[PDB]
Amino acid sequence: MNPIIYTTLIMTVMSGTMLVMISSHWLLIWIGFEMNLLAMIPVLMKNFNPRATEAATKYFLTQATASMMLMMAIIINLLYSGQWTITKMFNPVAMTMMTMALAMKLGLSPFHFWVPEVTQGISLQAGLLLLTWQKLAPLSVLCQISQSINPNLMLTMAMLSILIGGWGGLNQTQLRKIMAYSSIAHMGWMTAVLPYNTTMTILNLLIYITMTLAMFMLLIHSSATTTLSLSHTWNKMPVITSLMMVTLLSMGGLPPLSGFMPKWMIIQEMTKNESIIMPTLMAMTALLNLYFYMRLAYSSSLTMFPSTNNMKMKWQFEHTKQMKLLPTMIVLSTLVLPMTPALSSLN
Amino acid sequence: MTMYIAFILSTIFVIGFVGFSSKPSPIYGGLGLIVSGGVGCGIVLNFGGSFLGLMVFLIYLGGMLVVFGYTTAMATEMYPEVWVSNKTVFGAFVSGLMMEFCMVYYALKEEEVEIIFKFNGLGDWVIYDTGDSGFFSEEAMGIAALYSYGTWLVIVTGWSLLIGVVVIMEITRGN
Amino acid sequence: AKTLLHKYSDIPEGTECHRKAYASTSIGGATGLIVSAYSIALKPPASFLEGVARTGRYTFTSAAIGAIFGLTSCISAQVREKPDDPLNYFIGGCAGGLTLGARTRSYGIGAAACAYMGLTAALVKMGQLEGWQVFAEPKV
Amino acid sequence: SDAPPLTLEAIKDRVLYVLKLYDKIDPEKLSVNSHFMKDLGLDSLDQVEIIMAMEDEFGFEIPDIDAEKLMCPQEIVDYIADKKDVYE
Amino acid sequence: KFYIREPPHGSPDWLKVGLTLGTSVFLWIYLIKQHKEDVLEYKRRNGLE
Amino acid sequence: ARQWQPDVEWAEQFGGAVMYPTKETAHWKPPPWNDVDPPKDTLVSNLTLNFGPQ
Amino acid sequence: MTMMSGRPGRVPLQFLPNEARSLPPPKLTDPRLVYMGFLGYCSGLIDNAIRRRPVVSAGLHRQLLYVTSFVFFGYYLLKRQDYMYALRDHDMFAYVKSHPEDFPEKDKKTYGEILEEFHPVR
Amino acid sequence: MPLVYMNIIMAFAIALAGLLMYRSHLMSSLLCLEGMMLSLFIMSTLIILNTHFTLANMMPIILLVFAACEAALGLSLLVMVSNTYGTDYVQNLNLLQC
Amino acid sequence: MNIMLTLLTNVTLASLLVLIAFWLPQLNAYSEKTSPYECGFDPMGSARLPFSMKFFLVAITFLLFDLEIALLLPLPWASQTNNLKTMLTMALFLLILLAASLAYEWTQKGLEWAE
C-alpha cells in the first residue's frame, strides 16, 4: 500500500467517525458509518495473508448487517413520526432495532464473537485502531439516544459482555485475543452506566482508550503476539516489561492506579439509582480480567523465563522507530487517580 | 378494495424475496432479485414514483449482470441448485411461502399486531391526499433539489465513490 | 416474557400449589428451550434427531427443576404457615438442585446445585420482600 | 477429537473384511496366514488388485516394491502397523 | 569510538534544542500573563480592587 | 542456594494454542510465527475446448 | 443521563464560557498544578528510560517541555472543572429557591425532647 | 398501515433471515444483503411519497449509492477469498477461532 | 393500465409463438440428437466448471460508475433552479471526481485485464 493511499484511508475512517459525531440528521449518521466501514476494510488488510482476508470478510459481514438493521430502525422511526433528527426515537420497535444494531457494531455480547477473531487476524496497528477508534461513533450515537434506552436490554447485554469477556480471556495464550476480550468486558462496563450518566460512559471510554493505546504500543515496541514471545522481552528490554506489568495492574482496576477510577465512579453512580446487586456482580466478575492480567504479568515481568542464544545478537541493536506518545500514555494509564474530580469538565 | 393491484405487486415482491433468500444457486437468486426489483419499480410507479422506481430497476439490473458474471466465475458447482433440487432449499422456500400466507391471513381477516403494530388493510387508495395543482412533479423537484439544497450530500457521496474505487483497487491487489 | 413471571407471581405464596408449580414449570421449560436453541446454534449436533434429543433432555431437565422448585416451595410455605419467608424458597431451590444432580447423575453436582440454588432462591425471596431492583430505573 | 487409537485387532478385522469381499477368494478357506498364490491360487494381478483394495481401505498409498512383499493377510497387517506406527 | 555515522555527534542539534527551549519559555510567559489577566478580570467583575 | 526461576517444562504450559487443553482442542495447532499460512494446492482447472473440426 | 449538556445559553464548543471569568482563577502554586507538573516530569523520565538514555539527566530541554506542557494544560483543565462545579452549585441553589414546597423548613427539636431508643451492649 | 407496508417489512425480515442463515456460497449472502437494501429503498420511497416530504425524495438515491459501495466491497472480498481457496464456501474461513 | 395490457399482449404473443413452435412440427428426439455440441466430439469437462474473469476489476468499477448515472440524471430538472452557480459547481465537482476515479484506475493499471 502506498503511504499516501494509507493516509487517505485513515483520514476517511476518521472523517466518517466525525461525520457521525457532528450530524443532526439520521441519514448523515448512517452515511458516516458507511464511509467508516468502506475506508476501514482495506486497513485491516494492509499486510496480505489468508488470515487478514478472513478477518476483513467477517468484519464486513458483521458491520453490513448492523448497518442494514440501523437503516431499518431509522425508516421505522420516520414512518411513525416524520422526523429525521437524532433526538429520541418515537417507536419502541425502532428503539430495539437501533440498540441491537449499535451493540453489534460495538461487539457487545451476544454479538461479541467477531471481535477476538478479527483482532487475531490483523496486525497490532490494525488491532489498535479497531479497539480504540472504532468505538467512538456507536457510543456517541448511544449517548445521544440514551433517554430512549430500554434499561433491561442494555443492562443484560452489558452484564453478558462483562461475564463473557472475563471467561473468554481466561483461556487465551495469544495476546491479541486477550486484548479483544478485555475490550469486550470494558465495553460492557461502558454500556452498563449509559442509561444513568453518559459522563461516566465518556470517562470510562477515555480511560480505556488510554490504557489500550499504552498496551498496544508496548506490544508493538516489543514485537510479540504470544505469551511465550513476550516471555523473552525481559532479556532484551526489562524496562518495557516492568512498565507493561504496571499497566496490566492498572487495567485490572487495582487502586491507586488509573483503571480503578472508572469502575469506582460507575459503581457509585449506580448506587445513586438504587442499583446495588448489579454493580456488585460486575466487580466480582471483573476479578476474572484481573486474574488473567496477573497471569500475563507472572509470565512476562515478575519471573524470568528461559531465553535463546540468538538473543545475544539483538543486544547489539536499538529501535530505529520510536513512539512519541508512549511515555505520556503510560503515565496517563497509571497516575491520574488524584485528578479524578476533573471529570466534571467532561459534562 | 379497488382491484388490489398494489397488494398483488407487494405479494410478488415478497415471493421473490423468499425465492432469493432460500438461497439456490446464485443464478436463480439473481433472477429472483431482478423480479423483485421490477415489481418494486411497479409498486413505486403506482404510488407516483416514476423516476425512483425506474432508477432502482436500472441499478439493480446492472448489479445483477455483474453478479451473474461473478457467479459464473467463482460461485459455480457441477450441479447448480434449484428450488426443488434440495430438501433444505425447498423447505426454506415453502416455509417462506406459508409464513407470508399466514401473515396475510391474520392481516386481512382480523386486526392483529404481528410485530410492530396492527391494521385492517382496506387497500392503499384510502390514504392518498387528492392534491390538485402544479405544472411539475414534486418527486422530480425534490430529487433535483440535491444540487441546490444537498451540497453536503453531494460532497460526501462523491468522496465515498472515489474512496470506493481506491478501496477496491487496494483490496484486490494481492501480493 | 415477563408475562410468565407475572403469572407465577400473581398466585399467592402459600395457596394453589398446583397452579404455582405449573407456572414454574412453564418458566423452566422456556429457559431450557432457549438454552437448547443456543446450544444447537453454536454446537451443531451432527444430525436432526440428535439435536431433537438434546433439546428434549435440556428442556425436560429445566422443566423438572422448575416444577420441583415451585411445588416444594409452595408446599413448605403452606405447611409451615410461614409465607414471606426465605426458608421456603431455600428448600425449593435445594430440591431443584437435587433434581439437577439426579438428572446428571452426579453427587457433587447435586450437592453444589442444592446449596447454590437454595441461596439464590432465598436471595430472590428477600429481594421480593424488601423491593430490591435488579434493573433499576434511572431515578437520578 | 480425531479417530480413536486404531489397534492391531481393528486393522486385522478390516483387512479380512476387505479380503473376503474379493470375489476370487473362498470366504471360509481364507485365513490370516494364507498365502495368496499358494493357498488361494491367485495370480500376480490378483495380488495387485488386493493391494489396491488395501490402499482404498486404509487411505494411504503403497509402492510396488513393498506390495511385492505383502503375500498374505498377516504381512499386510504388519505393513499397515509399521506405516501407521501401531504397537498394539 | 563508534564506526558508524552516529547521528548524535559530539554536538547536539542546536535547532531542535532552541525550538524546545523557546516553546517552553513562550508557554511559561503566556501562562504568567494569562493568570495575571484572569486575576485582574475576577477582581474587576466582583469589585474587589 | 538460589531463587527458583521457570524452566522449559514450566514454560511449555503457555506455549499451546489455548490454555486448559481439552480433547477437542488438543488437535488445535498454534498459528504460524508470521501470520502467513502455507498456500493450498487448490489447482484451478483450465477449460478444455474442442475447436473444430466442424 | 445527560445532565448539563442541554443547559440553555450553552455555546457548543467553547470549553470556557465568558461567565467563568467571574470566578477566581486557580493559583499557580495549586497542588493540583504541582501534581500535573509531576506527571509531566514522570513522562519525561519514562521517555528517557524507554529510549535507553541516562534517565535523570539525558534531555533537560525535553523534560522542561514535558513539565511546561502538562502545567499549561492543567491550568485550563482546573479552570474548566472549577467553573463546572460552580455552575452545578448555582443551578442547585436556584432550583431550591424556586421550589420552596419541595424543600420545606421543619422546626428542629432538641435532644432533650426527642426520644431515642437505647440498646444496651451486654 | 396499508398491507403494502406489512409486505415490504416482511420482505426485509425475510432478507435478514436469509442473510443470517448461511449455506455454503458467500454470493447468496451478498444477494441477501442487496435484497435488504432494495426493501429499504422501497419502504423509504413509499413513506416519503405518501407524506409528500419533497426534500426527502433525494434520500433514497443516496441510499442506492452507498448500497453500490457495499456491493462492490463484498465482491472485492469474495474475489480474494476465491483466490485463496478456489471456492467461495464460508466453511474455509475458519483459520481464526474465539 | 394501458402499459399492463401492452406487456401482457407482447408476452402472450411470444409464448404463443413458442407453443406453436413446440407443438406443430414432428419431433424425433434421441440421445445423439440432444447431446451437447463441441463441433465433433464429446466435451472433456463440464460447462458448469468455473470460468475465469480477466476483467473482474473493471466489472467491480462498473458498479460504482453505474450510480454516477443515478446522481447525474436529474440534471435537466436541476438546471431550472434559481441558484445556478451552486448547482453548476456541484455538477462539475461530481463529474470531476468521476474523471479522477477513471484516471486513478487508468494510471494504476486497473483497466488492464488479468493475464
Ligand SMILES: CCCCCCCCCCCCCCCCCC(=O)OC[C@H](COP(=O)([O-])OCC(O)COP(=O)([O-])OC[C@@H](COC(=O)CCCCCCCCCCCCCCCCC)OC(=O)CCCCCCCCCCCCCCCCC)OC(=O)CCCCCCCCCCCCCCCCC
Ligand atoms: C424484523 C426482524 C426479525 C427478523 C426475523 C424474521 C424472519 C422471517 C423469515 C422467515 C421465512 C424463512 C426465510 C428463509 C431463510 C433461509 C433459510 C436457510 O437457507 O437455511 C439454511 C440452513 C443451512 O443450510 P444447509 O447447509 O444447506 O443445511 C445443512 C443442514 O441443515 C445442517 O447439517 P446437519 O443435518 O448435519 O446438522 C444437524 C441438524 C440439526 O438440526 C436441529 O437440531 C434442529 C432441530 C430442533 C427441533 C426443536 C424441537 C421441537 C419443539 C420446539 C417447538 C417450541 C414449542 C414447544 C413447547 C413445549 C413442547 C411440548 O441441522 C442443523 O444443524 C440446523 C440447525 C438450525 C435449526 C433452525 C435454526 C433455528 C434456530 C436454532 C434453534 C433450533 C430450535 C431449538 C428450539 C428453539 C425454540 C423453537 O438450513 C437449515 O439449517 C434449516 C432449513 C431452512 C428452513 C428453516 C427456515 C425457517 C426459520 C425462519 C426463522 C424462524 C421463524 C421466523 C419468524 C417466526 C416468528 C416471528
Ligand SMILES: CCCCCCCCCCCCCCCCCC(=O)OC[C@H](COP(=O)([O-])OCC(O)COP(=O)([O-])OC[C@@H](COC(=O)CCCCCCCCCCCCCCCCC)OC(=O)CCCCCCCCCCCCCCCCC)OC(=O)CCCCCCCCCCCCCCCCC
Ligand atoms: C469453617 C470451619 C470448617 C467448616 C468447613 C469444612 C467442613 C464443612 C464442609 C466439608 C464437608 C461438607 C461437604 C458436603 C459433602 C460433599 C459430598 C460430595 O461432594 O459428593 C461428591 C462425591 C463424588 O461424586 P461421584 O463421583 O459422582 O459418585 C461416586 C461416589 O463416591 C459413590 O458413592 P456411593 O455409591 O458409595 O454412595 C453414595 C450414597 C450413599 O453413601 C453412603 O453410603 C453413606 C450415606 C451418606 C448419606 C448421609 C450420611 C448417613 C450417615 C449419617 C446420617 C446423619 C447423622 C446425623 C446428621 C444430623 C446431625 C444432628 O449417597 C447417598 O445416597 C446420599 C443420600 C442423602 C441422604 C442424607 C442426606 C442428608 C444431608 C445432610 C445431613 C446432615 C445435615 C447437617 C446437620 C448438622 C448438625 C448441626 O460423592 C461422594 O462420594 C459422597 C456422597 C455422599 C454424601 C455425603 C454428605 C454427608 C455430609 C453432610 C453434608 C451437609 C453439609 C453441606 C451443606 C450442603 C448440603 C447439600
Ligand SMILES: CCCCCCCCCCCCCCCCCC(=O)OC[C@H](COP(=O)([O-])OCC(O)COP(=O)([O-])OC[C@@H](COC(=O)CCCCCCCCCCCCCCCCC)OC(=O)CCCCCCCCCCCCCCCCC)OC(=O)CCCCCCCCCCCCCCCCC
Ligand atoms: C504516592 C506519593 C508519590 C509517589 C510517586 C510515584 C512513584 C514513583 C514515581 C514513578 C515514576 C518516576 C520514575 C519512573 C521512570 C524511571 C525509569 C526507570 O527505569 O528507572 C531507572 C532509573 C535508573 O536508571 P539509570 O540511572 O539510567 O542507570 C541504571 C541503568 O539504567 C540500569 O537499569 P536497567 O533498566 O537495566 O534495570 C532493569 C530493570 C528496569 O526496571 C525498572 O527500572 C522499573 C521501572 C518501573 C517504571 C515505573 C512505572 C511508571 C510509574 C507508575 C508508578 C506507580 C506507583 C503506584 C504504586 C505501585 C508501585 C508499582 O528491570 C528489572 O530489574 C525488573 C524488575 C521487575 C520487578 C517488578 C517491579 C517493577 C515496577 C515497580 C515500579 C515502582 C514505581 C516507580 C518507582 C521509581 C522507579 C525508578 O531510575 C532513576 O534514576 C529515576 C528515579 C527518580 C530520580 C529522580 C528524582 C529527582 C531528583 C531529586 C530531587 C528532589 C525532589 C524534591 C526537591 C526538594 C528540594 C531539595
Ligand SMILES: CCCCCCCCCCCCCCCCC[C@@H](O)O[C@H](CO[C@H](O)CCCCCCCCCCCCCCC)COP(=O)(O)OCC[N+](C)(C)C
Ligand atoms: C474547517 C476547515 C475547512 C476546510 C476543510 C473542510 C473539510 C470538509 C469538506 C468541505 C466542507 C463543506 C462546507 C460546504 C457546505 C455546503 C453548504 C454551503 O457551502 O452553502 C453552499 C454554497 O455553495 C458553495 O459553492 C459550496 C461548494 C463548495 C464545495 C465544493 C468543493 C470543495 C470540496 C473539498 C472536500 C471534498 C472532498 C475532496 C475533493 C477534492 C450552498 O448554499 P446556497 O446555494 O447559497 O443556498 C442554499 C439554501 N437555499 C437552497 C435555500 C437557496
Ligand SMILES: CCCCCCCCCCCCCCCCC[C@@H](O)O[C@H](CO[C@H](O)CCCCCCCCCCCCCCC)COP(=O)(O)OCC[N+](C)(C)C
Ligand atoms: C487518561 C486521562 C484522560 C485524558 C484525556 C485526553 C487529554 C488530552 C486531550 C487534548 C485537550 C483538548 C481537548 C478539548 C479542548 C477544546 C475543545 C472544547 O471546545 O470542547 C469542549 C468540551 O471540553 C472537553 O470535553 C474537555 C476535555 C478534558 C478531558 C480531561 C478530563 C479527564 C477526567 C479526569 C482524568 C485526569 C486527566 C489528567 C490530564 C493529563 C466542548 O464542550 P461540548 O461540545 O459542549 O461537550 C460535548 C459532549 N457533550 C455535549 C455530550 C457533553
Ligand SMILES: CCCCCCCCCCCCCCCCC[C@@H](O)O[C@H](CO[C@H](O)CCCCCCCCCCCCCCC)COP(=O)(O)OCC[N+](C)(C)C
Ligand atoms: C400466430 C399467433 C396465433 C396462433 C393461434 C393458434 C395457437 C395454436 C397453439 C398450438 C397449436 C398448434 C399445434 C398443431 C395442432 C395441435 C395438436 C396437439 O397439440 O394436440 C394433439 C392432441 O393429442 C391429445 O393428447 C389427444 C386428444 C385428447 C385430449 C383432448 C381433451 C378434450 C377432447 C375430448 C373430446 C370431446 C371434445 C371436447 C372439446 C369441445 C397432440 O398431438 P401430439 O402427437 O402429442 O404432438 C404432435 C402433433 N403433430 C402430430 C401435429 C406433429
Ligand SMILES: CCCCCCCCCCCC(=O)SCCNC(=O)CCNC(=O)[C@H](O)C(C)(C)COP(=O)(O)O
Ligand atoms: C473400459 C474399457 C477398458 C478396456 C480397454 C483396455 C485397454 C488396455 C490394454 C492394455 C494392454 C497392455 O498394456 S499389454 C501388457 C504388457 N505386457 C505383459 O503384461 C506381458 C508380459 N508379462 C508377463 O509375462 C507376466 O509374467 C505375467 C503373465 C503378467 C504374469 O503376471 P504375474 O506376476 O501376476 O504372475
